[PDB]
Every structure is written in C-alpha cells, then in structure tokens.
Design a protein around this nucleic acid. Structure first.
Ligand code: K
Ligand code: K
Ligand code: K
Length: 249
RNA sequence: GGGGCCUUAGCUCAGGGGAGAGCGCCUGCUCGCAGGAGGUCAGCGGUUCGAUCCCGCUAGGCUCCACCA
RNA sequence: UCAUAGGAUAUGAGAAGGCAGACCCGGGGAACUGAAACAUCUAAGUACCCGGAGGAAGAGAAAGCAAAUGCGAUUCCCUGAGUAGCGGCGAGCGAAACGGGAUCAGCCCAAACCAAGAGGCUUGCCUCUUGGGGUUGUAGGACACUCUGUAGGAGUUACAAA
RNA sequence: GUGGAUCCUGAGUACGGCGGAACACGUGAAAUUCCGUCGGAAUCCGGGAGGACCAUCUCCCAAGGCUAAAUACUCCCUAGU
RNA sequence: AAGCAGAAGAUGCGGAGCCGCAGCGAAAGCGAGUCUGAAUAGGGCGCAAGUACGUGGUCGUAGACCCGAAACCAGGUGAUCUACCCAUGUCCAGGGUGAAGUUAAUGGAGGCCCGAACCCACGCACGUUGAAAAGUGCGGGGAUGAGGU
RNA sequence: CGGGACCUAAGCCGAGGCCGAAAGGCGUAGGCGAUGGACAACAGGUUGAUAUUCCUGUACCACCUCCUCACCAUUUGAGCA
RNA sequence: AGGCCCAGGCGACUGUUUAGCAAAAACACAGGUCUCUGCGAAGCCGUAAGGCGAAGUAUAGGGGCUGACGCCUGCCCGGUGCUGGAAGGUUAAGAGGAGCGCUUAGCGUAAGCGAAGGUGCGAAUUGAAGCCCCAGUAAACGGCGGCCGCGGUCCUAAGGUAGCGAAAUUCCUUGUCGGGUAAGUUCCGACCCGCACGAAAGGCGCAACGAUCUGGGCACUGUCUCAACGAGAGA
RNA sequence: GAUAUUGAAUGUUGGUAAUUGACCUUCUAACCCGCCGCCCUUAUCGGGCGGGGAGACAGUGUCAGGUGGGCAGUUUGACUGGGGCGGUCGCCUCCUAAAAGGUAACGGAGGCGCCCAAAGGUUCCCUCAGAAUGGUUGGAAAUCAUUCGCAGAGUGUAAAGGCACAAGGGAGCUUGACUGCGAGACCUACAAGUCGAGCAGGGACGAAAGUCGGGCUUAGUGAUCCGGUGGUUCCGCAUGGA
C-alpha cells in the first residue's frame, strides 16, 4: 500500500502483479519464472520483491528484456530454468537484408506479446532472437517473413549466441532538460516540451520533471533522438559548467 | 568610490600548440545527408618558443558594498 | 474463616528544640578568579546549604610498610621535598615510605562444635532463639587427647557492669 | 601443650565489564579506594598485596565490631602576661 | 629540626635531616675526569670556600603599595508598590437614543449617545535647590463595562 | 454595638499518607480563615473629657430552678432528639 | 452646557500599552485559517508526588499566523521544515570471539620453539531510532528571472496573476500633467522607468468610530502687523 | 536500542554436544490502572480485600546512539593618518638608504612555500647573442659554410651581485645530495640563522696534483607539547620478564 508512492501511477499495474508473485514463493515454496520483464520492470521487481530472493537472465549477458526467477533461500537457479530458446534467423542474406525494425514488427505481427521475447541480437555474421520456450514452436512456425525477407528459424543453444558515439561536452546543470538539450543538440525550451509531454525516459522510467537530476551512468531515451548515456561527469570548467561525456547508441 | 565577475563565429558554447562544434545561413540531396559562411578571441602592452586561454592595465555590462558621528 | 490492618488503654527523666559565628565527621556543592583570551585545568571539594555529633571528632590493632642477619595498630609533629610524580606536560597541582620525636593498649565477635528450649516435624532431619565454645597466618580454632584453673588476676577509658 | 580423620574461618562478597568519583596521580602504562549498574569467584591442595600484566619470591588473611593517649578548637570561668 | 628540660626566656640536650667538599652523562655508569664518537682524534661540560645566623636590596606565594568598577556565583528576604489571578463585598448624579419582541403604539436592547462622582492622562502653560523624587491650573478621554474600587 | 465562647469562601495548615540526595514538596481526615451568612435595645438625659456602654423610662434574647400554676406521662410510654 | 465643514493616509469598532519624556498606525479584539490533541488528551508547572488543562472530551482543549465587514487570496514542493515511506547505502552500546601479544611448565649446546592457565588487545558476523534516499505538503519556512529581435534564446523549483502603484514603500525627485493658491518641495487626482508594491509577516476596497496622522475651508480671534493699558502673585 | 526488574507455554528457525540463542503467537502470576464493589472510614488521599482491564509490554534504574539556542559557558586577531569596510601579516631580491653596516611609512618594483637522480660529484674538452655574404625545399626567421663578433648570450626560477684562466656548452665514469666532527669567524635581545680551514672513517673522479659534506650566489619554510615508525651495550617501582 505504501510502496506505490515510490513509483509512477501507470506502474502500479505491474507492482500489484509483482506483489502477487512474491505471495506465491513465500507461501508455496516454489520458484516463479516470469515473462521477459522490461528493463524498467526489472528495477520495479527488484524493489517489490525486496532483498523471496531474485534471479534474472535474458539468455546472453546484456539483454534488455530479461525473464526473472523468484526463488527462496534455496534452489539457486540454472541457465535453463529460465526456459529460454535462442534461434538463428535464416534468410537469403546475399539478396535481402533484415533490420531490427522489420524483425520486431514481424514478431509483433504474428501476435507475439513483447513479454514473450527478450533481445534481438544483430552481429556481423548472424541475426538471432531469444524467446520463452513455451512460445518457441509457435514463433518457429509462424515467423515466415520479416519485412521483404522470407525467413525461417533454426533452434540453437544459448552458448551459440553470436554476441558508440563518444561526445565529450559541457552542461550548466545535471537537470534532465539541460542534459537532453545537450545530448540531442537542441534548445532547452524544445527539450522541456520533450520532457513535459513524456518522451524522455531515464533508465526506462518516464520522467516528466524537467528539473530531475541525472546521475553518472543513466541511460536516457529521447524519443526522436533515440538513446544515449551519460557515462562520465568530469568536474567543472573554468566558467563553471559540468564536464560530461555522452555515448549515443 | 572600492571590491567581485564577465566580454569567442549569425546564434549557443567548446578550447601556451597556432580559434572548434551544433544550430541558422549558403552547396546538391530528398529527416537524415554533403561541403561551405563567419573570429581585431572586448581592447591595450608583455611573459615567452608560440598567448583565447600568461600577467599588468584600459574599456564596458552586471553584482556587492559606500557605514559611525 | 482463622487472622492481620486498624482502634482503645496503660507504662516511659524515650524523641522533638537550642547553640560556641569555633573545632570534627558525613550528604549536596558554586562562581568570581588564575591560565595574561578560553572550553580541559584552576580557584576548590573552598564558600555556601543540609545531616550527624563529641568533648574532642575521625583513624586504629596489618588481606600493612617493605626488600634488612627487617619492621610490627592508629593519630599528630619534624624531615623526606617543592623531591618522586601529575599537568591544554600550560597555569599550576604535589605525595608517600624510610629516619627523628610526642603518646602508647589492646580487644570482642561471626562460623565449626556443645548444651538447653522453642516451632516446622522437611519427620531423628531443618530452621530459629538463649547460654557455652572460639578468635587466627613460617595458620588458628572446632574436634580429640593428656594437662590445668575454678578464685590469685582483672575491672566500669575498649577489653562485662552497677 | 600435642595430633592432623573430617569440619569452620565473614557471598550476591571479592573481583570483572560499563559509567562516575577519590587517590598528589587530569585514562593514562594506571596499580590502589569508593559509588551506581550488570555480570559474578575461590573458600586452606584456599585467598590478598608488593603501581598495567604474568611467573617466582616476600609479606599478609579482606568482605563483622570496639578501643584511651599524643591532635584540633574556645561562647565561657579563674589567674596572669 | 621536631622534641625533652627550662621564666611563654636565655641555655642545655637532640645529628634525624640540610647544604658544601666532584664532576660528567638521558641513563647504566665512570670519576679529575666524563659525554659524544669506531677513535690515544677533535669538541661539550668539568678539573687544573663553604656553611649557620643577622641587617639591608630585590624576587616568589599570599589582597601583597592604597582607594575604585560594571559584573559573576551561593544562600536568604520581598506581590503592604505594581502585573495577572482567586474568594467576597461595594460604587456608577442626571439626561438622551429607542434593538428584539408584542399589539402606529407598546416594549426597554446596547463593550449605544451626552454628561457629574469615580477612573484615566491627550494638549498647553507653570513648576524644574518644586508646594510635589511625576504635581498644579485650564482645557481633554472613559463613565453599565473587556468598568472602577 | 463590632470581634470572640456561631458558620463557612478563596487560601493556608495538615494525624496517618504519597513523593523526594538532605533540607523538604504535596495532600486525606480534620482544622484555621471575613471581605460574606447568622445573631437579642430603643428613645431621651448627662460629664471638662465615655456613652445603643453611665443614668431615667420602657424592652428583648439565651440559659437556669429554692419556687408557683396548668397540662400530659411513667415501657405504642410522655417528652427530648 | 458641542465650534463646524470638505478631502486623504492608517487602524474596522469599544477596549489595551512604555507607573515617571512615546497612547500610536503599536497590543487586544470579534471573524478567518493552519496545526496538534481519543482523554492518565495534547500543551504546561514540578526531580517526583501533585496539579492546571477540566470536574472539560474533537461543535472540546493547546499552539502558530491573520485580524470587523465586502470582493478575493495567483505561480513554485528544487532547498529548509513538517508528515509519510519502498528498495539501496550508512550508523552506538550490547552481543560475538577468528586471530594476535605478554607471561612460562616443558624443550633446547645456545639462538630460539613453546602446552595449560592467567592477562592484555581484538577481526568477521549481529545491532534501533536517526541520516542519505523516495513521496507529499506553501493561510509551512520561503521564493516568484536575464538577454536579444509577441517571437527567439539562456537560466531556474518556478519566474509576480488579480488588484494597487512617486505609496507610512519612489533613490533619481520639488518626476510629469491637472486641481486647489496671487504664489503650493506639503496636499488631492491622474500617469506608470514599481531604485526596492502585491495577495492571511494577507491584496484591494470600505459605512461607523479616533485626545490618530495629513491637506483645505467657514467662524473666530493679541498667533501676528505692533504693541498698549489695567488686576493680582513674586520681584 | 541493549540490559535489569522479567516469568510460563506453543510454534518456527540459528549455533554448539541434548542444552543454550533468535523471533512469532498465546498465557498469567510479577509490574501498571487518573476503572468498579467492599472494608479501614463521618474520607474523590492512602492502604487492604474482591472483580475487571492491561501484561512481561509499560514504567523505573544503568548503559548507548540520535535530536536538541529550550538552556549554559565561551570565542568572534592585529596593523590601520579615528574605527568600520577594503588591503596586509612568514621568507627572498632590488630601490628609497644620505659611497661601511643598519635604517621607517597602508613608500616604489618583483619573486617564494620549489625544481633537478642530473639541472649533483669529478675528469677531459669547448665558447655564446646577433649580423653580413652565399645557399633546392626554405620565407624575416629551421639547417649548413665563411668572416665579423666582450658577451650585445647563457646561467632551472624573481632580482641583484657575480661568471668567458668561465660559475655558460659538451662528453666519460660516478653518488661527497657522505658518517663522526670542527680551530675560528659572521649575524644576533633570545630562539634561531650563516661561513669554515682542518682531523678521522670509508668512498667518487683523476696518471698525479688535487677536487667533492648538493646545485653561480642569496628564497623554497614552522618552535614546543603530543602521537607514529626504525634503530638501540640505557632505565625497568621485590626479583626475572613485560
Ligand atoms: K675533553
Ligand atoms: K633578605
Ligand atoms: K586623520
């Protein structure tokens, strides 16, 4: 009841369900695997669960959408308890190209919910996707086209997964509106519109406060400029602006 | 009057090593591209191997003081 | 309910209060001041308040001092010595023992145990109250032994008390 | 006076931790003494002290009491300086 | 020296104690030397008249040449003045206005009005070694109230 | 007449009691405490100096019984309370 | 035995106050609001006992601010306070003793090693409130922008709304214009470049009230032009 | 918050070999009641007795942390053409400074709170700035070459005094940027500061003479107390240790 204040009002929905997962693992003494919780929902769950222990794995290390195991003080989990299936996306690579937008659009097009798949990995040699094992056969059967490319899915082990723009700058403050303006190369008044409407996120939390102070190692997500990361804050200049470093995706 | 701070390209700002970056403005190309435009670095005189970034002064603009009989 | 609380009556040269503005032992306890400021510190356990006294008080018969072919209760004086030491190691604070003197004195219990009685029988055990017993350190006492005294010695200043 | 079969010889004490005070000694290397609090012995094959502490040695026997004199003082009284 | 004897004396006794006769070194220690140092070196400090008592000068600790704060602390004494409160009394000439209510009249409200006592103290003058350590005179405010006493 | 031998308010004191280094603080029963309640005497006269106080006249209140009279009554028995 | 009138500031009012240089625009006030307080209330006095609160009980009691009435009371929760709180971080005594030192029975030609006990330190681990942190809250403390050409741009927690404005606030200033006067640094009304108003440390109005402050009139006068005479007290 | 007062049970979860912890719930008997009835007792005190409530909590004690101008004791510099405000405070160099030395002002100018493992030591060798004339890049100015050339350069750094038998530049080998000291001087209120031949130990460089106890010279620093570290033929509170 006195947890919601710490999160947003829309985020209440997840928090209610996150409390219902903790309820199970305490009383029934059994691990609860979840449906690839979003990077934000990782942060929320971590809080709602409390310290019921928690584990998280999205197949490869550095998956955005990862599935969480809520386990007690015993039954420390394995890599396959997360019920993850990796696939290699086969297509006529010489003729057609698959991009992240097309493959994401195709996954959604076959009716797959965002919670039923993790990250879509693009390397030089392979395009791979990670899904929940319960949906693996459905996705393999239905995902026959991505954009203009005819595609097929080959099952692989997680071990077979084939896993910047540094921009040293100065800002007046570490307010959100100031950092966005700097990163996105805009007027601050324009950046304030972005923040206020609800287009910027900070670690996948929608921050609508222009004056929110941004810390070192915060993934900002300006809808319109993509995504960028305050990696370094490096003291202050002669004329008193924060020496900073940005790295766009 | 005294102290304290400021003076960089159209605009916003980076920056003892020979003055940049974005945006605007121009180049051709149709939300990104592709090269330009533009600086007495307030000025002055000097420290020196070179000064926007030393150091001393002059502007100007702000800021704080100018009290006690 | 037994009781007990409470109430009543009797007997008490029982207490109370005072002061000598002193001395003594306790409880509580400043500040100015000094430190060339000031907080630790100092002033000072002072002043002051309170309680208790007594003609004196307090201390006192080694769980001591010491480091000798030792000393032998305590108190007080001389000395040790402005030493040792303590100390924003500042300002300041400051011993003790030995040595020399004054004066001198040593005692009683508690306990073991014994005897008698009482009330809890916990049922031959336990607790309590009188009297005896006993009093200490290279241990003493109980307890046993054999001795020995029961009236010479001691006494109201402790060591019983008129 | 002689014996050491047993028994007795001061317990919520000594002592310790924490917090204070007293010791010339200000927490210090800090013995010793006392108070509050909490913990808490041994008991003669025992215990205490000798300035942290241990060992050895030496000296002593706490946690019960009493005790004159030498000492302090003078509102007074007497005699005097 | 205390102390004992002795006029509250001198004095006698009393050698514990004190200072000096040897220094050097932090110290163990060594000693006319010693410390430093590897050193017979060099250098430091030493070697090569005190003491007891008295007078005087000065210093220390004491109030310390005398007089003087504003203050600080401790323990008492004061609410007969004054502040507020509590209990219980008491005071407020006269006149006016005319709320509610009642049936234009009636009615008699009020930190209501004018205005003595009473309370107050706004202005000015006077007084200022006063009549008076806060007043007097002329005016002034409140005067049934959060009133005076 | 005013006060006491009557009453109580505020407050104060306070057996036992509660609390507190000491001293003490607080407080019950119970008291004290008028500024309040209650309560019987008036007019005139008089002295240099007192007067509901003395004097004159006429009163009233409480209490008492050597007495007088009437009435009621001696254990459902007056009456007091 | 009332002088009166016109106009303005302040405070609504009657009250109250610096005994003895200030009576006021200061305090109080009825009204408003915020807040605490479930009763052995909170608050307060007292070491406590005992009390007040109250012989009351949320329509009550305490505290803060505001100050009749009328219209109203804007924006900012970053900071500070208050209230509440999830993760994460931090943190006392106490608890806990892994280790280590000193000591020495023993053991070693010595050097040194070294049981047990005593003793002196002692790490991990554990450990509340609080704090960091997060959320709310402005009739809480407070704060309510620059620059350039309504737009741009920088900065901020957010940039002053309504109303008022040379004001008990305006330095410059005797601002400017108008009114009143023969002549008006004061006064009144406008204006707004508000040095440095502004919404309960309330804003703007406001009838009644004032020994309030301020400007102007009528009346009146020895206040004055400008003095003169008389009475009394002192001299 | 710990701990005492402070107990009993049931669960559950630690840690030791069945005892002792931790926490949850329950219990009643301590403790509490500014609740009711009864009694002491004419009593809204107090106490006793019986109900009820609450309960090992609270309260109180000790200890601990937090908060805490509610309260307490204090501090809050000096110079200064009055004080405040501004500026300054130690060290070095120059000028003022009057041809020894010293010498003031909120007089005039600047530096310092280091740097360097060579930018120290020694041995050997050397000479700089700039200009003229000639040169593919290449220019006024890089690199040659020639002549001229008291220094017009350099000397880690401020300035002054010095320095070309170099104190300036280069190279080799090195660690004397030594230990013990020190006749005697300078400076000086003290405290400190400065110079020093020479002696010993053991070195570096050099054939040797010799030079070397940092740097061309003069700034580059801070008393005591207290505490840390290393060393130590010292002391060690009966003795041996500590
Ligand atoms: K010598
Ligand atoms: K003398
Ligand atoms: K002057």
């Amino acid at each position: 009841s006195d947890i919601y204040q710490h999160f947003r009002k829309d985020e209440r929905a997840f928090i209610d369900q996150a409390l219902e997962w903790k309820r199970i693992v305490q009383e029934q003494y059994r691990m609860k695997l979840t449906d690839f919780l979003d990077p934000r929902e990782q942060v929320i769950l971590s809080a709602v669960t409390g310290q019921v222990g928690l584990a998280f794995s999205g197949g490869y290390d550095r998956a955005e959408r990862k599935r969480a195991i809520l386990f007690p003080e015993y039954i420390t989990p394995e890599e396959s308890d997360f019920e993850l299936q990796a696939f290699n996306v086969r297509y006529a690579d010489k003729f057609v190209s698959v991009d992240h937008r097309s493959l994401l659009g195709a996954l959604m097009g076959i009716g797959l919910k965002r919670q039923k798949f993790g990250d879509i990995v693009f390397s030089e040699t392979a395009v791979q996707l990670i899904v929940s094992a319960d949906t693996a056969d459905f996705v393999a059967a239905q995902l026959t086209q991505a954009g203009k490319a005819a595609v097929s899915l080959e099952k692989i082990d997680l071990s077979d997964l084939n896993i910047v723009e540094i921009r040293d700058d100065t800002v007046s403050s570490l307010r959100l509106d100031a950092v966005c303006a700097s990163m996105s190369r805009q007027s601050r008044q324009k950046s304030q519109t972005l923040v206020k409407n609800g287009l910027v996120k900070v670690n996948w939390k929608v921050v609508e406060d222009p004056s929110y102070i941004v810390a070192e190692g915060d993934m900002l997500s300006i809808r319109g400029f993509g995504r960028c990361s305050l990696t370094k804050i490096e003291g202050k200049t002669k004329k008193d602006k924060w020496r900073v470093t940005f790295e766009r995706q």
